[PDB]
Automatic annotation (TrEMBL), chain A:
Signal peptide: none annotated. This is WH2 domain-containing protein. It comes from Vibrio parahaemolyticus serotype O3:K6 (strain RIMD 2210633).
Length: 226, 218
């Protein structure tokens, strides 16, 4: 995903954008949300492999399981006593325990179980299309994209700054944004654009306080003409 | 009072009658002033004539030093550093009569502080605190059950705004109590909803209804 999406002051400068740049940013933000959305790899890999051999796993029709197992199988002492379920156990139970593989140059190499798992998972993330990932996500896409949204640098201290209540209101608005199952992209793009234009000031103490002050002035300047 | 310690004070306060609200606000204010702590190691360090201390203009300065003098060891500023370093260490002591006693380092510092405390009234504390009454009382306000989890629920920003509103409510050191009472009364009436997501979003909504209603008049 683009660099501009990752600015920490994104919410600050978004309202200073042109309605052209704003549309671009919102579409890109949306695209980034779907692209980076995660799934339960521990679950979907295990489901795709349980009952199969090491070689069978190595040449599956799923490129993403192929990439996953390729990483795992480098460390025989992690699965060699299903293998996938064994490795998942041993790697997590053995996080910070050093596993052994053989380098390309024939040297010995040790790597922490947790790094091994994160790598295997990253490889699978690299080998799946957004299309298949979304099909696997189903309607949990709403929670997976929101999880990505909350990880953005611009969302860094949202809950702590604006409070639990505001944060959960934001979540509700986010979930509610998804109207039709076949307009996901279009919908969340609109929610993003509306809020980016206002810098998400609908969920902040200062944004709301300012709007109240604005309204008091607007009411005053109106009740005057009459 | 009993209502002051309710964790749901802000929920129940908007439902109070004028009489009850005014009483609550006044009780709350009194509590803040009663419970407020004084920065003594700063008050007296800034108010310090070894002998003129014995019968000084301020009754609280003599009491505090009258116990720091008993022990052999700006000198009061030195005694503070030698005592805050004392702890379990015992300070040699003497009496006018033969009898010689002892009192551990910190055991001395508290008795001096305590003497100062017992020598003053609440409305003397306010004069002493002066401008510091702002944060002293606010620190007490924040320990109340009703104020628990305020920042977590409403956010740090709204909490800092509350503090700012709380501080600014203090106009003159002489009206400190009357001023903070009004701040408390106004907010208690509103349940402090001026500092919450729902309160502010409710406010925006009805104001937008008012504005539109009066605009359509054209
Ligand atoms: Cl590029
Ligand atoms: Cl190997
Ligand atoms: Cl690649
Ligand atoms: Cl971050
Ligand atoms: Cl957050
Ligand atoms: Cl909402
Ligand atoms: Cl839906
Ligand atoms: Cl704003």
């Amino acid at each position: 995903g683009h660099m501009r999406l990752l600015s920490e002051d994104l919410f600050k400068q978004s309202p200073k954008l042109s309605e052209q740049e704003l549309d671009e940013l919102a579409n890109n933000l949306a695209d980034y949300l779907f692209q980076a959305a995660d799934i339960d790899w521990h679950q979907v890999i295990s489901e795709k492999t349980r009952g199969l051999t090491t070689e069978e796993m190595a040449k599956s029709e799923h490129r993403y399981v192929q990439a996953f197992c390729r990483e795992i199988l480098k460390y025989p002492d992690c699965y060699k006593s299903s293998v996938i379920d064994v490795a998942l156990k041993r790697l997590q139970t053995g996080r910070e325990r050093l596993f052994t593989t053989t380098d390309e140059k024939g040297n010995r190499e040790l790597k922490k179980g947790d790094a091994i798992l994160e790598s295997a998972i990253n490889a699978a993330r690299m080998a799946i299309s957004t299309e298949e990932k979304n099909t696997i996500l189903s309607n949990n896409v709403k929670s997976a994209t929101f999880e990505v949204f909350c990880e953005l640098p611009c969302m860094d201290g949202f809950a702590e700054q604006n409070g639990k209540t505001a944060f959960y209101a934001l979540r509700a608005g986010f979930y509610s944004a998804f109207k039709n199952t076949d307009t996901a992209k279009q919908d969340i793009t609109k929610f993003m654009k509306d809020n980016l234009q206002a810098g998400f000031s609908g969920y902040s103490y200062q944004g709301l306080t300012n709007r109240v002050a604005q309204l008091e002035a607007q009411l005053a300047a109106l009740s005057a003409k009459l």
